[PDB]
Design a protein around this nucleic acid. Structure first.
Ligand SMILES: [Mg+2]
Ligand SMILES: [Mg+2]
Lengths: 504, 297, 500, 299
DNA sequence: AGCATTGCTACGTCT
DNA sequence: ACAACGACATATAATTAGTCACTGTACACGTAGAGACGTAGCAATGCT
DNA sequence: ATGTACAGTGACTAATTATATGTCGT
DNA sequence: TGTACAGTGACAAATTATCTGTCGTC
DNA sequence: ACGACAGATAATTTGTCACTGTACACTACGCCTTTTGTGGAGATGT
DNA sequence: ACATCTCCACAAAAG
């Protein structure tokens, strides 16, 4: 096929300058002198101009421009040593072994001596032998991915099913990451970085909701982001918003990684209740729609804040802990200004015309119904199975409970819903006609007065048995009423609770 | 002596302003044309907003020497059919010399008022601009070929200039392979090959036949400013540029797309983005710092 | 001031050759007539040629070439916006904040909207203005240090005092590095990377000893390195070494990282008992005589071993725990062979004349005395401000003890010395004439059928008391004998005292 | 014509074999000089193993133009007073630029050699292995002036060779400062300024008055190979190169080291390091790999 | 009577 | 004398400032902290 | 056929403006 | 005056690809 | 004419050695979550 | 005198 000349050197231009003069139509009675008047400006004998015009016809402008020797890029050490060098480097870089060329050359020295070869290759040759191999091993780091284009989109489930994302809320996507800001207690001492959870519309590419907090990735954290995302948004004048986060409604599907919180029974039961299927990505690359807003946050927000910790151990600022001053309530109040007034108002990078919110508000088949928030909560509550037993008692995590109709159902298993933040008021459900029906609120007897969280109810039960104490409602209460007798997890939870309690 | 000996190349600037597909005012295009000496035949043309540098003439050479394929949208009566390698060429940088050399014809570079006299100079926006550049391409090839070329010549009016040229060819006009005439094309350079052999061009995306072997490498492109729907990709070497494959435009909504249309698509896409108010996106920036200004360790 | 012309172009050569063609002297009336050839040669009037002569006769080749313009590197946005940009970027990047040129441009646009500026700097203008700052702070990142040259050297100390290094054993150094090799127990689960602690002779750049083991950086580790460094060497025929690690004898100084074991009491006791002075390192760079051999040894050894772990988390190769395959009884042999048959014979990097080994043997001030092994094993850890009982008996860390000659003394302040790896017995010392003098060796009450270590007895005391057991040496011993560290310690149990 | 009017360059290849300052054979030098074609006296002169080339010619031209001096070990009874540019320099493109800079005509395309070659060099024990290029300095630069130029030819006015020179001026040259024509010196294209203004060159280290401000930047050197104990540091501009600092070699035993001696000194370090009996040292590498290959994986 | 010594627990602080 | 540096007003052109379409590249849980050895809180188990 | 998409880049182009030129000048 | 080894620039020595002669009939 | 003999000559790789950029500055297999089959009572029914 | 179910507590993989 076509070979095009380019970057002609000036002596090749001189070759062109004669060729463009010989291009005047000529005959033997004219070629000889019109050649010779060129040979004098080539300053070389006629026969070279004959070979020049020969090669010009044979190959064109790339015929008159010289081609590198057949030997270029081919070594003279020969086939044995070319292999042995490359063999030795190749075996030295599989597994975690990282044998560099110098160690290869030191092997080559050993090999020649034991081979009785008196002329081992020099280290410069060995480095030149591997230079193309090293470059091929380098290039693999750079190969770019085209990405999806235009409106049409699908997401690659590990089931192998490409779920089309035909409209807004059709697939929401969720993941967590460690924020790159060291936070502080309100007293100013260092609190280790929070986790951020994001829920994202895959069409529209709005961020739909977040949860920011010190709690590790957990189904209660997932459920907390889901609550914020699904519910309408309201923010007070302490959030100085100019935009408004006008997005709500349920997803039709929910697309995740394989984290144990996402693969939890709790979440799959929320999906069955609210009405979406839970799908897992094959690999993080397929997650890019949600992995990327982190970097747009990392660059445009977290990096510009006091106590940015740097995206890597090789990159943490030399005084991140010295500069650390933002609290969880303060970082959230900024992050919400970023999302409402900025990120969701930016163009969708596939579309250019539409801001991420306008690609939402316009892309809904119908305006979602305003969900009753108690119903959302009730189907966010995790649940367990127990049987009503004698006297209408039922056990759940060492506590005992009863409610206004329980004892009639003694002898069979019931479904009951519990919130780990306050287990003291269980909601219990019968199954009848193979349908779920609510019975009553089962109250923890003697504890129908103030809230008890599940985590201490576990931890107390573990350690209280070292006292040999009987475990009961009153003894776990007696193990709770004096917990005022400070440490990181206390700092985090008290700060983390202290953010949300302004809601009204 | 004979017709088809010396080929003239002429330029003008068309005093008709045009409007874009979305209503933007276009400029006034330059017209470049390749004509015989001894016939008045027209054998090559290019028209556009590119200045009459070496570009528009290098394309107008390519226009003439290849077989004159034509589209139904032109509503042509006549086959133009004017293939043939020239042998002398005459024009008002040096690049024309390299083409002339490589194609083996002497370039010895230093009548459009027929269309000024014709009603061509009275279409809307001549001298409401309700016409566009693709409409000129379709009509002007017709109004030249079917009317200004096929008609009787102004003097030596015994022959139409096409037929005076057609019989006068010293033998028969000989077409030559397409792919050897890539030097006449436009050039774009140091494009990078993405996974699976993919390329971006004019905000569009492209893919090649065997180009996936050179993902992560870099390559050059050549094209016609008349249909970028498939553009030629070549691997760069130290003094050789070797043709590798065609690459095909993907996701476009039409079977054909001129370069001007990719400019217009981008310009509409760009001009939409320019109208979005940053007022919220901006005021949050100073307010974030005014908050952080309260920080002390 | 001398200035020389550079990048002499073709057009400058054209301009130069005509200048040289008129450098040939002649009468001024023909001079002003032969220069007329320049007119079409330069396509300009002779008045420019007169100007060119006025330049060249004034300025030579430098003024014959065209200058850069007066506005090169000057930004037409003016001093307000160029100040504003460099102010905003530098304050935005103070401390841990890391603003970027794109973030600066948003500030510029914001302030312009406040100012009602009709035409504020474009982002690429803002990016251009910062390019000098980025480059100047980049070059400040990578400046090479010359390093010492020749035989003369002195080492800066955290005291501020600078201490010359004059002969071999004048100043030893140590630090610990975490080895980049995952290596495994018998049959072999992954365990974890060990620590390497090395003694380096600052004169010879030689290396007299190492301790390799899973033990954290601790005074028992440093002491066991010095126990290796100071003694004569004998390695078994199972190593099949070609060279003998003939470096022994004692330092006049020990210059070291300021690690808590290097700052420990125990080592200071060794300093008094062996006569070296401990000196602290000011900053890490001053340690380079021992910092760098970790780099050298990582590159030339650990990187070739199966369990290699890379130089950082961000470079950590994922197969390390998939095929870690050495045990420390092999990694010892690899490291010891590398030192004794290669590194000892390697050339000293700035002498060239001789190996690392010969700059030790030829450089020491005189042949040192080879001490009795038992004397360093009398340089045990010691405890003080304790008291002897009014009887033939003693106590230590809730152990209870007997002693042959203690009954001649009433209850009084006592000093005692112990092997932490064999706390079965103690050596007891008295302050006679204000000098330490031996009382007796001593033993735990009735303990002879078995031997005990200090670390396991300390751990046993925790489980002893928390169960409410009656505290005694009898019960404490049971809580010793009634796991990661167990695997690690039982690997370290493999020792040359069973093999020499 | 005049003693500053017309100077002609000449060259010769010496018929003596040299040993370094330790005792190994080097080569037979090249030798080059310029002679005033008016006075016919041997003035600026260069000797060394670098073969005649525009750099060597330009270096000998500096040796002519610059006022000559001798060290305290010579204090010689005879000396050159030669200095200044000629009106024409003869050596019959780089030599055009020096002439265009200094303003003298450059021409390029009776000689004295036998007065040294046959009369002296053939008499030395090392004539064409036991004298050194430090010694072959005075064994030329003395005799060339203390005998040859001090000789008289009645062919040219019956005066000593240099008396015709210093008599024969239409206007007596002024001396030129050393700083005015570094263009004759050697060149180093890139050097990196190390911390504290230190710079490595010829395996030595250099420091100078203002060079530390350029630490982490790149500078150019120019130097005189007859003694590298000073080097000149230059900073390149857009299209100019400005004299930055002088610099001085740290840690020398004697403040006279020539480029030839620094090479031969560094060749001691190279030969010493290369003397290692490394073949017994290779056993570590092959047996380390054999051990690791003896460890098969657990699964 | 008196303390007096003995064996843990921070709270750093450093590598 | 007239070939030397001014006095222009006007080009000439090389600077900066701005527009765009490309592309590399990190987003993928991860260092705050393990693990030594004090100075200083402590209890205790003795005893005179 | 299609991970994501923003910050930084390159390759020009419009505007600025530093200063080279040609003629007269004394 | 941290340390100092693996990688790299500029060059000479050696190899050897191929292109330049004087030529012979075409 | 072209191209065809033996040998020149511009590459090409092999090998030296002064120079410099960089890591050594100890600092990942560890924190945290979820499922889950095995196991110990201990009220209750048979 | 017995058998039964139920509620609560511990080792392996993924982010
Ligand atoms: Mg995730
Ligand atoms: Mg250390």
């Amino acid at each position: 096929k076509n070979v095009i000349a380019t970057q002609l050197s000036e002596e090749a231009q001189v070759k062109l300058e004669v060729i463009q003069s010989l291009l005047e139509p000529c005959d033997r009675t004219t070629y000889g002198q019109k050649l010779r008047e060129a040979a004098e400006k080539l300053n070389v004998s006629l026969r070279t101009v004959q070979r020049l015009v020969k090669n010009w016809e044979q190959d064109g402008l790339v015929g008159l421009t010289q081609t590198s020797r057949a030997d270029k890029g081919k070594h003279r050490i020969g086939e044995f040593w070319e292999n042995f060098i490359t063999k030795t480097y190749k075996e030295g870089n599989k597994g975690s072994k990282r044998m560099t060329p110098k160690q290869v050359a030191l092997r080559v020295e050993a090999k020649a001596r034991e081979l009785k070869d008196s002329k081992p290759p020099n280290y410069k040759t060995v480095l030149r032998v591997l230079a193309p191999i090293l470059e091929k091993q380098q290039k693999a780091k750079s190969i770019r991915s085209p990405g999806w284009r235009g409106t049409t989109l699908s997401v690659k489930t590990r089931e192998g099913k490409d779920l089309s994302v035909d409209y807004s809320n059709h697939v929401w996507q969720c993941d967590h990451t460690r924020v790159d800001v060291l936070l502080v207690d309100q007293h100013g001492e260092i609190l280790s970085r929070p986790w951020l959870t994001t829920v994202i519309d895959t069409y529209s590419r709005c961020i739909m909701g977040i949860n920011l907090g010190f709690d590790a990735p957990s189904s209660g954290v997932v459920a907390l982001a889901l609550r914020h995302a699904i519910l309408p948004k309201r923010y007070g004048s302490e959030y100085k918003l100019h935009c408004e986060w006008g997005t709500y409604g349920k997803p039709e599907h929910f697309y995740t990684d394989g984290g144990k919180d996402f693969r939890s029974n709790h979440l799959s039961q929320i999906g069955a209740q609210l009405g979406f299927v839970c799908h897992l990505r094959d690999r993080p690359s397929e997650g890019g729609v949600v992995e990327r807003p982190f970097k747009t946050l990392n660059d445009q927000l977290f990096s510009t804040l006091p106590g940015y910790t740097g995206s890597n151990v090789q990159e943490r600022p030399e005084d991140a802990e010295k500069d650390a001053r933002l609290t969880l309530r303060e970082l959230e109040q900024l992050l919400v200004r970023y999302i409402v007034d900025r990120y969701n108002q930016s163009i969708d990078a596939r579309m250019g015309d539409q801001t991420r919110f306008e690609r939402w508000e316009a892309g809904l088949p119908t305006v979602p119904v305003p969900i009753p928030e108690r119903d959302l909560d009730i189907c966010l509550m995790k649940q367990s199975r127990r049987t009503v037993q004698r006297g209408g008692c039922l056990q759940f995590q060492n506590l005992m409970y009863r409610g206004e109709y329980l004892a009639g159902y003694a002898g069979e298993t019931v479904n009951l819903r519990f919130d780990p933040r306050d287990i003291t008021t269980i909601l219990v459900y019968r199954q009848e006609n193979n349908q779920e029906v609510f019975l009553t609120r089962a109250h923890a007897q003697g504890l129908e007065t103030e809230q008890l969280a599940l985590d201490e109810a576990e931890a107390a039960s573990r350690r209280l048995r070292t006292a040999g104490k009987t475990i009961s409602n009153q003894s776990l209460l007696q193990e709770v009423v004096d917990r005022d007798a400070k440490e990181r997890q206390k700092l985090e939870q008290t700060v983390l609770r202290s953010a949300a309690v302004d809601e009204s | 002596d004979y017709s088809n000996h010396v080929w003239q190349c002429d330029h003008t600037r068309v005093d008709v302003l045009l409007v874009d597909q979305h209503g933007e005012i276009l400029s006034r295009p330059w017209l470049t044309t390749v004509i015989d000496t001894y016939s008045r035949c027209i054998m090559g043309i290019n028209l556009g907003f590119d200045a009459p540098s070496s570009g528009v003439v290098a394309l107008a050479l390519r226009h003439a020497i290849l077989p004159k394929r034509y589209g139904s949208e032109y509503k042509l009566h006549c086959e133009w059919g004017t293939y043939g390698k020239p042998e002398h060429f005459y024009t008002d940088s040096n690049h024309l010399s390299q083409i002339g050399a490589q194609l083996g014809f002497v370039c010895h570079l230093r009548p459009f008022k027929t269309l000024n006299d014709q009603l061509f100079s009275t279409l809307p926006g001549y001298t409401d601009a309700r016409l566009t550049l693709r409409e000129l391409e379709q009509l002007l090839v017709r109004y030249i070929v079917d009317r200004y070329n096929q008609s009787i010549d102004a003097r030596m009016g015994d022959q139409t200039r096409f037929e005076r040229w057609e019989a006068g060819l010293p033998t028969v006009p000989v077409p030559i392979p397409e792919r050897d005439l890539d030097i006449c094309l436009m050039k774009q350079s140091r494009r990078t090959v993405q996974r699976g052999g993919c390329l971006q061009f004019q905000n569009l995306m492209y893919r090649g036949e065997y180009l996936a072997g050179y993902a992560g490498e870099t390559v050059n492109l050549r094209f016609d400013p008349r249909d970028i729907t498939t553009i030629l990709v070549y691997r760069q070497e130290n003094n050789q540029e070797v043709f590798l494959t065609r690459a095909h435009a993907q996701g476009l909504e039409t079977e054909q797309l001129a370069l001007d249309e990719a400019e217009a698509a981008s310009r509409r896409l760009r001009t939409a983005g320019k109208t979005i108010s940053n007022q919220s996106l901006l005021q949050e920036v100073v307010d974030r710092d005014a908050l952080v200004a309260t920080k002390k360790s």
